[PDB]
Amino acid sequence: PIETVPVKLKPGMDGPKVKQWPLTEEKIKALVEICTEMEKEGKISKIGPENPYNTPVFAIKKKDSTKWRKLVDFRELNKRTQDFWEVQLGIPHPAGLKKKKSVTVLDVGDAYFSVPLDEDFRKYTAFTIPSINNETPGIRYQYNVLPQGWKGSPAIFQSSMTKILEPFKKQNPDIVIYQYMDDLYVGSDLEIGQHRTKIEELRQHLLRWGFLWMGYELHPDKWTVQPIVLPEKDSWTVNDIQKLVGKLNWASQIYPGIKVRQLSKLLRGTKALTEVIPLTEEAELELAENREILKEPVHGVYYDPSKDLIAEIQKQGQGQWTYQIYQEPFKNLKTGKYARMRGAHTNDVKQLTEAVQKITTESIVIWGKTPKFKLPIQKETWETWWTEYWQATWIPEWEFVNTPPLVKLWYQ
Amino acid sequence: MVPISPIETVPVKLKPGMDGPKVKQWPLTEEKIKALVEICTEMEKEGKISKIGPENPYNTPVFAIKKKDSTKWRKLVDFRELNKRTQDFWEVQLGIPHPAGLKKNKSVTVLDVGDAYFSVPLDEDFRKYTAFTIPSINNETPGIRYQYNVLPQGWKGSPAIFQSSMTKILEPFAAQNPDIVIYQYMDDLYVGSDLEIGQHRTKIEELRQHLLRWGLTTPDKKHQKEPPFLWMGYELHPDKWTVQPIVLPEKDSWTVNDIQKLVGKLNWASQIYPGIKVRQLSKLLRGTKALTEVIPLTEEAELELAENREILKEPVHGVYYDPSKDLIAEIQKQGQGQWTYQIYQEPFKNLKTGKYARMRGAHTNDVKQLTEAVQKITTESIVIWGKTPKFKLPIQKETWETWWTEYWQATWIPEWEFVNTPPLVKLWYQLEKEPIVGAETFYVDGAANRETKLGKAGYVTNKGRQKVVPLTNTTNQKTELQAIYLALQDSGLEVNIVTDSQYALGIIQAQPDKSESELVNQIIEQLIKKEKVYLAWVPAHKGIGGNEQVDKLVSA
Ligand SMILES: Cc1cc(C#N)cc(C)c1Oc1nc(NC2CCN(Cc3ccc(S(N)(=O)=O)cc3)CC2)nc2ccsc12
Ligand SMILES: [Mg+2]
After folding, report:
1. What is the effect of changing residue 444 to G (chain B)?
2. Which label site among A411, B17, B197, B243 has the fewest CB atoms less than 10 Å from its CB?
3. What is the second-level CATH architecture of the domain A96-120+162-217?
């Protein structure tokens, strides 16, 4: 690939100028080693002071890998980079991917380093390996090839990728292969024995076209919107009924037809919270009718690709996390719950960080893009620690929730 | 002739779509012109500038200035216009090392790189934009026109390009001499090591031999400064560091300007003088732009000042960093949202100290502030030392475990241990998860008229206790909090409370222990006195008994 594809920023926009955040000594040392080898290989070059741009960099470890990896946070550059209709008008997101029995994620970002980056665009990929205590000026580099994590790379590389894969595709017409940023998502309906074979047959096929050896295994089998469920009880206290009426009142914003009149009737008077109330027949019927309504899908839920996906997350305690993805309020496109997050039984922020990556992975499989997160955490705590648990090569956007939502109870 | 390597040129551009400057040269006296001609003739002989013909259309004004006793003229080329039109550069880092992150170098030499500076060539394609004109005597001949071949002092790119050029030249020497440290500050190159003075002098000679490859002569700095080095507001001694003298002035009359300089001195001092406090002195600046407005000091600002004077009566010093020892950070609560900390490796030998002040907020609690202080110190430590310290915190392990397991937000603090240094951070109340058997149930409500601002707040209970209080100059939100307050006031030590106020729930669920609202504060004080409180929420206007009744009592 000698010819470079011309790339520009969006009209009227300059390059990114994002501060490098401070890094631990071990991460700095790892980045120095990685970047020295990349410079020897010609992938990056030292830059001079006439380049004022910057994108932050840090170091991670992929899931169960002891080797440090460089992660550039290209979020600002990506939003400033021209929109891409690379080879066509767009790849309609494969709706069948989320239906496959198993989906394997392969890191193919290494392929990007074989394509040269437009010489006039390189300056915008500048990044700094910082020094400790400001004791030396940072080490300043820019990219000479397509960088991992940049919006342009999959777009510019897509012609090369579609050709690399065609013989495999022609042979396995029932396997879905979808690319998002540095990752390939390979789904089929076989048993892991055959699927692993295919996956190993694909990376071998990739190795003969010029890898990593890692893989993530997903089962989008039952990704849906979790029903609202109401308690089934033989004796209701005043408190139980108050909680039920509150939950139903909330559900009524989602579902037409929810009624609470007959259940409220049970609370006639000023009763002790722990007093047992017998259900009348009218209230039993009303609750049964609400129960039936909640079994149906929500009305008028549809994905609109011109709108952001929103993800909200609630800490439920005891390592459990609930979440909803939507574009408009009360129109959930997907809901879910996680428990016993791996390797963080004593660390809230690690658990939250892993939930954010799992949800982002689900969002890429279902819609082909990442959601904007509403995180139940103070900004200063999140910003101090999330990079310490990040293991993905993309990074989504996020905002912070400082007022406790009443709805955590309803997803409880 | 000994061949020398050229210094790599930095390519420079004007900002997009902008042209170079075209600023008219001012008239000058015959005296200043003679002075400028002499100066520029000498600069021209040294290669710094070159005469140019009349084709160049750019121009920057030049001036001639004096000094009090120094009885010679100075040249001044005013590049402000060109600076506005020059591209941005990766600037010399605004950040400087913090002394507590430095490590011992027993031997230090200061080289003068003033002369090396003029070997840095200016990008040939950019020189045209630096044209200037010496007006001629009596304006009877064409003015003498020059441009720069070297980095003009006062031009926007000169510091970044000079620094980058030196760094690139020094880099191989630094990497092949890992036992020395090199730090540049304008015309000063500081070269340090921990070697015996003989081996150190040799490295300095080797460095001079290295720089000669570019034709650079670097002699020692004139009038070698004895220790300590006066650097960036510090005193750096071979084995210790402090700030330069902190002298708080005595005054009968303090203006808004006087208090600003006081906080700045105090803020500078707080990186080594433990326990400095600036809240009560900062509260005297809240909202004011007139800097001579004499603001009388509160008895609490006087106390604070007097307390800082006591802390500042004697110099204290910090130690430098030892990578072989642990890094420990200890925090104390000072009150009124203020926190102090020490970072050290050995007991009683601080690397540095610091402080942290509560963020502006309607409500807050001590555990949240302590967490924020931890995150600040964490980030400062990564900056200075490249690692997180072990923390010593005035909060019991069991208190922290209760907090984070029950708090609605994710929260984390890194490896830490309890230090029993009052006052301790604690949880002042915890609400129940389930309704209390045998505790009276208060249904509370309040409401207010948006126009008249008249309201009511009250409750009804399962024992037939009831209260409605008429209120003036109030709001719905305020009456809703007032209702909860009345129920707390009038109940036993265990109480179930039912509200429909989403506003009140949102406040109380945030677990504040202090507020800017006296009413919230009064509710917190009531909560602290209870043994058990269950707070339950119901939707308004849904016919829920108890709630419906009290809603009527307070809605007119
Ligand atoms: C070399 C240097 C000097 C100054 C000044 N002004 C500032 C900085 C940032 C410097 O840069 C670095 N300084 C160090 N350590 C320090 C440790 C403490 N001392 C003070 C001292 C020692 C000995 C004598 S003495 N007996 O020779 O008179 C006098 C004064 C200076 C060196 N480490 C690094 C690492 C990367 S840069 C850098
Ligand atoms: Mg009401």
Report:
1. Almost complete loss of virion production
2. B17
3. 2-Layer Sandwich (3.30)
